[PDB]
């Protein structure tokens, strides 16, 4: 998945 803080 996307590893940023969402």
């Amino acid at each position: 998945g996307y590893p940023g803080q969402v």
Partner: antibody, heavy 116, light 110 residues
Framework: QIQLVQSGPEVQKPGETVRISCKAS????????MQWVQKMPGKSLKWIGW????????KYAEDFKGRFAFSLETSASIAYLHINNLKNEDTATYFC?????????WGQGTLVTVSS | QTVVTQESALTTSPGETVTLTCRSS?????????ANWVQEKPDHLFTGLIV???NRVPGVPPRFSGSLIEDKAALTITGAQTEDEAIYFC?????????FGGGTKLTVLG
């Protein structure tokens, strides 16, 4: 209403340091990461990196790591971009933008002008 | 090396549908690129429109929608309004960094 409000345009000499501020409101600051973006005049946008506002850990783009650094003042809901040893090519508008994934809400932009 | 390519400019008329596209140098854009679309108006005023291919940012008019069409990401404005004249940028995620396209200047006639 979510709003990111950045410090006003700034002028510095080559070799000096600048700090760009980004004050967030309208949501819990530590629940979304903060991206930083550069737009040199007349050119496109470059991702500088993000900072995780919960853990305080940054992730940088390779071309900006080093002179560009991120910090926080979490209690104030502020994210900062620090640029040191400024160079002529750093003249640009800098934006904070909230995750995500990517760039959901944008600050108004801060134009940093490096003098001759 | 990784390059995101957008149309430099295109024109529509008010009330028509228009589609802007976003191509990747790595091959097909997929949902793993988390495609974003953002709008720039004067004076360097950026609004987020779409994130994660097709998720419209709250408060953006529903005439804006994101999708994948063939191998590209696409922004469709269904019924473009005069005030939609602006520069539209897409951004794609490539494993460990975001890359922006060069922007499309959308003209709306009239």
């Amino acid at each position: 209403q979510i709003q990111l409000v950045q410090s006003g345009p700034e002028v510095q000499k080559p070799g000096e340091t600048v700090r760009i501020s980004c004050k967030a409101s309208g949501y819990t600051f530590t629940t979304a990461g903060m991206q930083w973006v550069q737009k040199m005049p007349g050119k496109s946008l470059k991702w500088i990196g993000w900072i995780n506002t919960r853990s305080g850990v940054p992730k940088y783009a390779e071309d900006f790591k080093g002179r560009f650094a991120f910090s926080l003042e979490t209690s104030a809901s502020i994210a900062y971009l620090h640029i040191n040893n400024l160079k002529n090519e750093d003249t640009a508008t800098y934006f904070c933008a909230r995750e995500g994934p990517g760039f959901v809400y944008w600050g108004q932009g801060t134009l940093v002008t490096v003098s001759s | 090396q990784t390059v995101v390519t957008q149309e430099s400019a295109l024109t529509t008329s008010p009330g028509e549908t228009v589609t802007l596209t976003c191509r990747s140098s790595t091959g097909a854009v997929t949902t793993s690129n988390y495609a974003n679309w953002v709008q720039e108006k004067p004076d360097h005023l950026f609004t987020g429109l779409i994130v994660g291919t097709n998720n419209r940012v709250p408060g953006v008019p529903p005439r804006f929608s994101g999708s994948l069409i063939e191998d590209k990401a696409a922004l469709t404005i269904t019924g473009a309004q005069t005030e939609d004249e602006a520069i539209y940028f897409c951004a794609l995620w490539y494993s460990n960094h975001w890359v922006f396209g060069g922007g499309t200047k959308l003209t709306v006639l009239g």
